[PDB]
Symmetry: C3
Subunit: 357 residues, 3 copies
């Protein structure tokens, strides 16, 4: 198999410390991630923390090279480390190929998020021709409309509305107050945060003598497997065919996906991104916070767009792309902005000077 | 009557194909839009699709000149066409002045969106001094507060909250989970998507010795007729007088309209637009996706602002307006950004060189 | 005590007029703000309005120097004025140090917002081990989860969801349809508008061979006293430690606060601001509408960032900061943008010309 590496690994990992009322031995945690325990496996662990923040009842890890210098000083009970960093480490190491990935897996063992038991709350309204798997949970005041299908092991939070004929595949999780319109089809293991709206009618109007005329939005939405949708994110239904979200797509908070957008597998979009109608984004792309795409363009695979960029055209070459200006102190920025308005004149004058010299 | 034309007609129409369980004859569809059927009117039609996407049971249309070349190859059962394009067309044409406008009208005939019957759900809470017209529908777990007025033929979705004294005019449609605060007055035929919040208190604070002091927001909101409000869009109440939205205004998703904004008739705003307090926008304007307006400025009629522009001043001349930079590959953008910071120096040096030559 | 002044005072105050069904005498209003009534205190006042907008039954004020010229022409029943402006004023003055601050206080006396009586609506679901103070109000269809604590004088609106172990301190106000996830701790006198989501899981993923792997977000949120949170604003929970919001922080609508952000006391953020993970903002800062911050940077105290700026680095000096370009007519902007792409070439050519001369 060919080696893999992704530049996102460079990103600083948030610092912090979590103390839990749960406990696991180091041996139990190591077994979960296939770690070799170099030291006593019997130590109880009652939380997780980054190196400088960790105490003796917590497991830590080394993720960023910038914190390697603090490893020998950490008060952590044990540390997830590569074999190289474990060599000569004074404490207990849990030796793994990738400490951060191991931490990612272990984090779930300490999660305090509520887990609902199977069953439908007495106050939930479920249409007679809707089908809710007996292993699913449906919370208080949720509404499940005609023909909807709720798969095995799905959690539907309080106040969710699941529109007519909409489908949630096995293992899905919807926080309280998620809205699906009709004809939204979702694959397996979705995760949707509160306030998300999926399948709304987007802007579909034609101008007739100055007056906007509504176009009915009669497509739906198709979402693949292993998709994340952040808080208050909106995804429009299609005009005729479905808006399409691929497998493993991870959408942050307050994103706007317009009608008929297509997002390829394993693409990530950071918060506040807006994608205009019919834009097509390939696989393994990343859009940073606040990026906008104009409509009816295509982005090829392996494209990264930096924060607050306005993407105005199709991208056919992998790489990173940007727009905007450097931040400056306001008084300095004002001078730069004034000169930008003079650029056409400046260019003309430079050309004339070159002719003269 | 003077001729009309709008540049928005240039926009590419989304491709797609919708197959329906409903059917209409070509004659029935033609009658709905005043089309002349050149061919057999008896053909059943079971959906709508764009030219390259259409099959023989679907009606299509020609909207963009870029797809005219595909007309003779379309597998559509029939096509909405101008008389000019119908001349020499091998299949069945439905001849109309404007194929796209005809399609816009016909799209509604195939819409699968749920239509609630008149009546108030047993779980809806309606204040004794609220007035709900008997032809209105009110969905499950909706709350209608004191003095609210729900007009004839209005649909209030599940979980809506309609605040005290708020009014929804005849023929309005609110998706599930719309919130109106108190003293929101809406005219006829509104359409509001899920998650919208109308009448909230916006940022109203004065600084006293470094501490922000709340100003009560004691105006309301007035919205005209035929207004669209997209998913998770917010419109603040006014400080003293109402925030004002004119007739035929079409607002896309995730828009933020601040306190005391005024929007003139037939203006359209694309998704993620933010309008700061007391900005006044005229009639027949269009703001593209992600545009921002600073507060206390005025935009005249017939102004178009391109995507992600920051509008910093009043606009008194009709036309198009922009800010930002071209998108470049990141490494190239970084060089451009570095030179922008040097522009004041560059200008000074160009002036000195001109003096020397 | 040292004198105070803040530049925000320069901002234009929205115009308007509010007529009320409530009434107070001038004497009662004056007593509320410690004003000296120069004229008859017995006049009933039935609303508030700005100078040019006011009628004889309303109290007005002078806030912006730009409206001083209209003072003698105002039809207001009385006007809040400094001693300097009251000198030679023909009508009734209410003399105060700061007319706008006095108006801010008085505005609350005319607020029509509903005030719920103490008690829990029969349709509210309150966990047996949740604690709701008897002086709190809980609206229809609200859900209060296990271990949650609702303090004295708190108002929980209809359809709110208060997650497990979450805390709302004394005097808090939540509009209808606010969502708190589990382990959100809020201090006293919070004000949260409809649609806000507090404590959601933000984007927490690591890339493994092209596939995003979920990191559990097992921190919570800590919010101080006197915080405002606008409509549809989202605040993520932390990865390990809590996301932190200080005292007196005022957040406008449609803001996105990412995981592990820290916001210092008395900072204000305008609508549509997005703050990426682990950014730290100091005290007494202001971010204008649509500002974005990249992750893992720090902003010192007393920093102002202008609208739609992309903040790319830590700020260590107080002051104002900006990015972007001036708005231009589109055709002119296009020429400027083309020249920006030529800047590296232009700089090289200017250097060569200087060498030649
Ligand atoms: Cl680390
Ligand atoms: Cl077409
Ligand atoms: Cl004033």
């Amino acid at each position: 198999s060919s080696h893999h590496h992704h530049h996102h690994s460079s990103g600083l990992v948030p610092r912090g410390s979590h103390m839990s009322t749960l406990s696991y031995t180091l041996g139990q945690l190591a077994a979960h991630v296939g770690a070799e325990v170099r030291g006593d496996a019997d130590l109880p662990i009652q939380g997780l923390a980054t190196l400088q923040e960790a105490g003796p009842a917590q497991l830590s890890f080394l993720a960023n090279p910038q914190y390697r210098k603090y490893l020998p000083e950490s008060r952590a009970g044990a540390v997830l480390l590569t074999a190289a960093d474990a060599d000569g480490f004074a404490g207990t190491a849990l030796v793994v190929a990738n400490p951060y990935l191991a931490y990612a897996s272990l984090s779930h063992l300490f999660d305090r998020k509520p887990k609902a038991a199977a069953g439908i709350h007495p106050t939930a309204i479920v249409a007679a021709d809707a089908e809710v798997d007996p292993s699913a949970s449906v919370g208080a005041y949720a509404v499940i409309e005609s023909g909807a299908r709720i798969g095995a092991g799905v959690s539907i939070g309080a106040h969710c509305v699941i529109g007519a004929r909409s489908v949630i595949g096995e293992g899905g999780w919807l926080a309280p107050r998620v809205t699906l319109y009709h004809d939204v089809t979702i694959g397996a293991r979705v995760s949707i945060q509160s306030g998300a709206v999926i399948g709304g009618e987007g802007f579909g109007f034609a101008n007739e003598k100055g007056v906007w005329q509504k176009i009915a939005q009669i497509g739906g939405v198709t979402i693949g497997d292993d998709v994340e949708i952040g808080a208050n994110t909106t995804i429009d239904r299609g005009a005729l065919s479905d808006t399409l979200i691929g497998n493993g797509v991870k959408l942050d908070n307050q994103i706007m996906i317009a009608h008929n957008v297509q997002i390829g597998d394993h693409t990530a979009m950071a918060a506040c991104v807006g994608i205009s109608g019919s834009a097509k984004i390939g696989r393994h792309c990343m859009l940073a916070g606040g990026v906008g795409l104009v409509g009816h363009i295509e982005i090829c695979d392996n494209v990264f767009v930096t924060g607050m960029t306005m993407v105005t055209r199709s991208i056919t070459e992998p790489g990173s792309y940007s727009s905007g200006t450097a931040m400056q102190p306001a008084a300095e920025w004002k001078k730069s902005a004034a000169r930008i308005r003079q650029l056409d004149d400046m260019a003309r004058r430079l050309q004339q000077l070159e002719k003269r010299l």
